[PDB]
Amino acid sequence: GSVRIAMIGTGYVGLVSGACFSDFGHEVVCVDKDARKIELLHQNVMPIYEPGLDALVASNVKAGRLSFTTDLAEGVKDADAVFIAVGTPSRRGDGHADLSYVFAAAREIAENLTKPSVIVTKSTVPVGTGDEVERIIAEVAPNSGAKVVSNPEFLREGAAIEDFKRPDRVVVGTEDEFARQVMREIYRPLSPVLFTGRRTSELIKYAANAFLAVKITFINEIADLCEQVGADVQEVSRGIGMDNRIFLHAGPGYGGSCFPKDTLALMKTAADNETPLRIVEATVQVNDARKRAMGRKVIKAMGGDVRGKTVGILGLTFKPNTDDMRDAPSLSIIAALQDAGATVKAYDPEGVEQASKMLTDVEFVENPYAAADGADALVIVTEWDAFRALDLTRIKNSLKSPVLVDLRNIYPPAELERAGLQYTGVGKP
């Protein structure tokens, strides 16, 4: 077994996917036309933060199953199966899926093509893309015997290895049993693998990523109500959570590289295919408005007048245990506070150098305790678990006003009562 694999793309996915494939004993080549990543991996410095990846590559480098390039064709040289892990960002303008990078890459594959390889769209793409590639293959390399599949990916950033190593499931969309037997032979070192049709499998990744955002934004909307009637959303989430058709926690919304656009593309692709998707249509419309309003929640907690005051922020990314600030909630929360004339200390363990390019006018620090140092208030945004065990009593002495806004509901309010702090969570009496 132990076969030849080309991962076109070496970003957050293509790296982690291809690396784990090498741990299965497969012959793996990761490609990226950015040089800096490849000229960082060859230096054995990972570009991004994912736990476990530090060893996982550097290991399989040495055992010699894992290779890096920027030359496409070196990878596509006799590869058994070729994976496409390139970006599918939102098209500036409408919101639809920028499939150009794929369509560029799928083409550049099709020419540099020795054997009847197997083409795997792993990128979160809209539906019938695999049909459209199937034209391009036939357009470029007609008699090359190649087959086109979709196998989407479901990993959470910050748990990518374990998500990949232990999947709930994995999805494969084709009808040609040859390619079915191949993708079987690939994924065989785990022992389930779900075999649907192509367009079905393309639809699932969107449908799931939509549905999670629905679940999050639902309880968030509930959490707003829990405030005004004096309920307690942690109990409520547990209240429905013990159902077998439910594990969900209130927040200032969702974000990340994957989520908020995949909604939007699905919302769009539904529109072109002439069906409404009202629930998901509502879902972003709350969510965009939500994280902004979470900023107004702070101002209300801070009396109402935040002209010229000073605000500490804990956490910056949309998610602990990575650096992916791409569509964080926090930017919207900051920009709200700036718009009412204020000033912004901000700590993130590993987000900063990526966060700086998205952020105007923001004093970053070195330390979470320093973020509160002479602020009018401190906001917790992202639950890096280091925050979960901190000294509350330093902070009361570190503040110009004893005002704390938990937004991931970590700290039990008795502690903030004990340290005499102004408690403000999400969904609280």
Add this chain to the structure above:
Amino acid sequence: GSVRIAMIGTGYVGLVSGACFSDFGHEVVCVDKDARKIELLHQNVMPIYEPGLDALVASNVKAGRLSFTTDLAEGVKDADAVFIAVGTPSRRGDGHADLSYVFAAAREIAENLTKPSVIVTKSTVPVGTGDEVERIIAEVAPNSGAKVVSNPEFLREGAAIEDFKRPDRVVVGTEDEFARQVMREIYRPLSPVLFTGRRTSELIKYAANAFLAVKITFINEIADLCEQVGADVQEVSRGIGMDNRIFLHAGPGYGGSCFPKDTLALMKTAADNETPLRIVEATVQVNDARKRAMGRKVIKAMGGDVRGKTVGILGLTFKPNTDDMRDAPSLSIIAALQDAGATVKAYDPEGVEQASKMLTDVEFVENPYAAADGADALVIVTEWDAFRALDLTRIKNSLKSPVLVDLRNIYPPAELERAGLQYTGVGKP
């Protein structure tokens, strides 16, 4: 232990709750101011269809822990705890919760009150109702030492006993440890019991019943999309289903006594308390429009012109294994077909005599095979499991046109291909 219990109300809930309480060995009195129910239970004829209830009452009648009346006070005579299981239907007009029946009953309790009993709202009520009762108690019987609780109920009709006997969870909302110890002492024969505050516990039943409707209407919206792009929603539901944060199946919508109004009251109660609930606000708006459109799905399948043709219906209720036609999908599906001038055979095993009062102009039958007999098409609506094993080949010979519309996706299309039938499910290529 084995204590005195009064269940004010003896409808779909109050019966099944109180009966199961008697099986715990508690002294149980069920009250209803309708006579006919009480003058049916005394004849040992259950009014409604619930599996297991036939024996469960008739048993505990004989062992003498279970009693019936229409006199309220006979039940409230020295009762340890008093349950309110009366109706909370939608207020004709706005849509809000008709809390008059409660407010009538809670009052009539408060006067006929010997001991410091314990008042339990079990009816699906809006929030702070338990606070409003707490006034009425204090208004009427101030020094009577009584406490007011909410313990909502979560059973599905058609599985009520097993739902009650094996709960995922049970909810209790108060802060007075006396009443906490009582409701403990009640529910102790199971061995969890969830103890929240009052308003929180009132909110949960709505939040859950909202959230399920969201889940159903979500995949339904997805199922519409699966049609137009040729996906396969059974695989898709399974595709997301293997997530641990998911077991959901496409339909023509939801209904029943409990669901579609509890949405609406929650939507309303949120409005009075000045927060929007956009997702649930979207959820009904699809759902009302959906089941009607499912009727138009039939017409499209039936060519488009259904003036003067004839249509068979399988299933009528919103749910197999009960008779509760109250807000079925089917009525909307029928009325759509009637509005394009057609004619309607309809079989339901146990819905009919209740269904007749909601339905104009509808030839009911005795038998599912007779519903198709010389129709232009047959529609399956409700999955009574008797339908799951039927002869398809009689039906092709029983039809003026070989047209079948599965709407709960039970029959695998190969069978309908085998019997040469016009296959039409929900979310199909």
